[PDB]
């Protein structure tokens, strides 16, 4: 046990006022930290560790700083050494050394801090408290990509499930620098570790705009075709989180093209994510809607729904995307036809039936409603058996409302009746709708407090009332009084159809 008088005396030498003495101690201690036997003897001596920590941060001798930092680094490979570093106030010192202009000292500091963050308890809160986050974010402008990979992983460990840390990164200009890493470098580890930080940051809603405004959507989209599976996946997850706040963000065309390509991926998780992002990005943005249509997005989304089967995780976002693409833009009509031309109508109608759950059904009804606007879809939708199921769904939804799975039954009623309203433009469809004994139900919907349900219920009744016999059955059901009431609505749409039904009942 040579450490009986070797360690204590060496501790004193490090504590000496003469720099040259301290320097000689530092180099020796540093060598002692390279062997299991002698390194253990340093770990068992807090006084020694304290001396190293103090020297490292206080010294103006670069070799000493290097040797003291390297010693701590060597200790950090073991449980005992990590705990020794922790308890001797190593972390604040290590954080301080992140300002070092010496690369070796800086690299020892980050590596040691990384090890502490990975393996030592209390290390995260200690680093946070010592102002580590600000430091680490300011270091993201360094050019060594291996250094950046370690730094970004430290941030990930700090930020994960910690609002304090996330907000500090946001405050310190973290998104800007992180997004810059993703647009500049090609080192896979760095891109990977950076993506996981941006993912953590992308979770909270208030945090998303900073990543978006910096150009994060495009920077993330840049790596979607990269060989790395883990990189692509993290980019996709982040993009999907962000895409809720990037619905009005401009310049998304390149990304959208790639997302449509990704729908043809062998990896189902890739397809699911791509569909989800496309769903988000196409919502209330005509440029995004148009772009997706131009690159054959309809075919891809139809084929995705077909390929998905009863996987509602995939069909729901795919159907939603299609619903977005079939309304309120220049190529909505092209899109409505495309769904038919690419053999979508069979599967779209199929999804109305069980075992589909309400969120999907709601989206599917909305899509069918849009598809019905195209006259060429009237007969195919009928021939696929859309009318009976639409009625059946309307009936079940009406019973409750005379939230299920997070879906209002009022929205199902409105959506089903709205679809039937559009379908009832076709004479053959009107025959089917009448044949299902829908007149009494539609008249009851005139009593609804919701104006949109009143409009579509009167709307469908209007269409049906074209036939004289149907008009008699509507009058016979006692629609006149509700209609007369609805004639005075401030909602012009409701009042228009109310007047129309009364008129057709009178001729």
């Amino acid at each position: 046990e040579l450490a009986t008088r070797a360690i204590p005396e060496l501790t004193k030498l490090l504590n000496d006022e003469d720099q040259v003495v301290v320097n000689k101690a530092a180099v020796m201690v540093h060598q002692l930290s390279k062997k299991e036997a002698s390194r253990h003897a340093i770990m068992r001596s807090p006084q020694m560790v304290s001396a190293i920590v103090r020297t490292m941060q206080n010294t103006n001798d670069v070799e000493t700083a290097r040797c003291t930092a390297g010693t701590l680094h060597n200790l950090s490979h073991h449980r005992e050494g990590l705990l020794a570093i922790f308890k001797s106030g190593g972390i604040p010192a290590l954080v301080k050394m992140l300002g070092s202009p010496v690369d070796s000292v800086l690299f020892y500091a980050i590596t040691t801090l990384h090890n502490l963050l990975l393996h030592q308890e209390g290390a995260k809160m200690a680093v946070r408290l010592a102002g580590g986050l600000q430091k680490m974010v300011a270091l993201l402008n360094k050019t060594n990509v291996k250094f950046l990979a370690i730094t970004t992983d430290c941030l990930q460990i700090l930020a994960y499930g910690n609002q304090e840390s996330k907000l500090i990164i946001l405050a310190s200009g973290g998104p800007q620098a992180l997004v810059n890493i993703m647009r500049t470098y090609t080192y896979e580890k760095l891109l990977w570790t950076t993506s996981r930080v941006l993912k953590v940051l992308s979770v909270c809603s208030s945090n998303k705009p900073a990543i978006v405004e910096a150009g994060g959507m495009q920077a993330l989209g840049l790596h979607l075709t990269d060989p790395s599976q883990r990189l692509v996946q993290n980019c996709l997850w982040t993009l999907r989180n962000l895409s809720d706040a990037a619905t009005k963000q401009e310049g998304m065309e390149g990304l959208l093209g790639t997302l449509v390509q990704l729908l043809g991926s062998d990896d189902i998780n890739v397809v699911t994510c791509a569909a989800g992002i496309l769903s988000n990005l196409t919502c209330n943005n005509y440029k995004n809607k148009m772009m997706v249509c131009q690159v054959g997005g309809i075919e891809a989304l139809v084929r995705t729904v077909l390929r998905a089967g009863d996987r509602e995780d995939i069909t729901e976002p795919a159907i939603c995307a299609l619903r977005h693409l079939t309304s309120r833009h220049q190529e909505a009509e092209m899109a409505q036809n495309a769904v038919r031309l690419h053999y979508g109508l069979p599967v779209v109608v199929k999804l109305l039936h069980p075992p589909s759950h309400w969120p999907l059904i709601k989206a599917t009804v909305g899509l069918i409603r849009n598809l019905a606007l195209c006259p060429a879809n009237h007969a195919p939708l009928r021939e696929q058996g859309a009318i009976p199921r639409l009625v059946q769904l309307l009936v079940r939804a009406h019973q409750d409302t005379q939230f299920v799975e997070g879906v209002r039954m009022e929205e199902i009623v409105e959506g089903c009746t709205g679809a039937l309203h559009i379908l009832a433009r076709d004479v053959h469809n009107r025959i089917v709708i009448r044949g299902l004994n829908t007149i009494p139900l539609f008249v009851q919907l005139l009593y609804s407090p919701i104006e949109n349900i009143q409009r579509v219920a009167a709307g469908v009744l209007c269409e049906l009332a074209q036939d004289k016999e149907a008009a008699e059955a509507i009058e016979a059901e006692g629609a006149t009084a509700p209609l007369t009431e609805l004639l005075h609505s401030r909602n012009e749409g409701v009042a228009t159809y109310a007047a129309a039904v009364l008129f057709r009942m009178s001729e």
Partner: peptide, 12 residues
């Protein structure tokens, strides 16, 4: 630079 390389090999 070997500081970083050796660390990378430990962690990942």
């Amino acid at each position: 630079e070997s500081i970083l390389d050796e660390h990378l090999q430990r962690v990942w």
